Amino acid sequence: MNDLEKLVELLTHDDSKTQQEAARDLAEIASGNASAIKQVIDAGALEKLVELLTHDDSKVQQEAARALANIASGNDEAIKQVIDAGALEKLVELLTHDDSKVQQEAARALANIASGNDEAIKQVIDAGALEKLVELLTHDDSKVQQEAARALANIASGNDEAIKQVIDAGALEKLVELLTHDDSKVQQEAARALANIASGNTSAIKQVIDAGALEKLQELLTHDDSKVQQEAQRALENIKSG
């Protein structure tokens, strides 16, 4: 049994600090080379990590979700593996327990998965992730709003059938109220999400402007933060040519 696998072993222990530290230490190893990431996978981390998500231990959940997150930042192989290990079911589950840092890692996790191909994107919507995600947009938690928006954006970067789901979940008007929030990153992600949704067809572009996106977006264009401006401008543009 090599070092990595004795870690997956330690995950199976009933001590809180034991699980947490092993989970934490996997979280870091899995945030390096593509090589490090696959070493983690074939060491069988995924079954064990996913099951930690169902222990009601805030700190443990936070490290097991984060680990999944970091693994989902690797290539398409990891993302396929994370999915086949049933993460999405538990991950979306974690979004309903009001736990700042745990909702946060869960979102980034889904978000990252959602950055994969179209097969990955479908599995996210089918796992009921949309409804829960949209809900997190109304929490008074700048960090959570950012990761939730970030996920939707990725998801709204898929096909028509995806964009349509995002609208149907009632994203649009929550997203716009984000544009008025005085946190740079949040605005950045909301605007990005909007910009993507507004790369669909006339139906999709229409429901954006009806949601009052235009004036807020043009408002952000006068803020002093390059990155936000870019996302706003890019947004005003796919709205414009329609």
Opening angle at CA 120, ends 166 and 138, nearest 5: 35
Question: Of the candidates 238, 231, 237, which has an alpha carbon nearest to the alpha carbon of residue 185?
Answer: 231
Helix or strand (DSSP H, E) at 191: helix 184-197
- Helix pair angle (129-136, 100-113), 10° resolution: 130
For the chain, how many structural domains are there in total?
1
Phi, psi (deg, nearest 5) at residue 114: -65, -10
Question: Of the candidates 181, 161, 237, 170, which has an alpha carbon nearest to the alpha carbon of residue 210?
Answer: 170
Q: Measuring CA to CA, how many Å separate 157 from each of 39, 43, 111, 131, 200?
A: 30, 33, 12, 17, 9
Q: Cβ contacts of residue 5 below 8 Å, gap of 6+?
A: 43, 44
Q: What is the CATH number of the domain that holds 112?
A: 1.25.10.10
Which residue type does 32 have? G
Per the CB < 8 A criterion, the answer to whether 136 and 150 are in contact is no
- Helix pair angle (184-197, 160-168), 10° resolution: 120
Which residue type does 74 have? G
Question: Of the candidates 100, 102, 21, 89, which has an alpha carbon nearest to the alpha carbon of residue 61?
Answer: 102
Per the CB < 8 A criterion, the answer to whether 178 and 187 are in contact is yes
Pull the structure tokens for residue 225: 């933060």
Q: For the chain, percent helix, then strand, then coil, each to nearest 5?
A: 75, 0, 25
Q: Would you call 138 helix, strand, or coil by DSSP?
A: coil
Per the CB < 8 A criterion, the answer to whether 235 and 191 are in contact is yes
Question: Which domain range does residue 229 map to?
Answer: 1-242
Which residue type does 115 have? S
Give the integer Cα–Cα distance in Å for 195 and 188: 11
Give the integer Cα–Cα distance in Å for 210 and 233: 18
Method: X-ray
Kindly tell me the burial class for residue 225, based on how many C-beta atoms sit within 10 Å of its own C-beta (0-12, 13-18, 19 or more).
Answer: middle
Which residue type does 172 have? L
CB atoms within 10 A of CB 118: 11
Helices (H) and strands (E) in the chain, counts: 17, 0
DSSP code of 30?
A: T
Per the CB < 8 A criterion, the answer to whether 80 and 117 are in contact is no
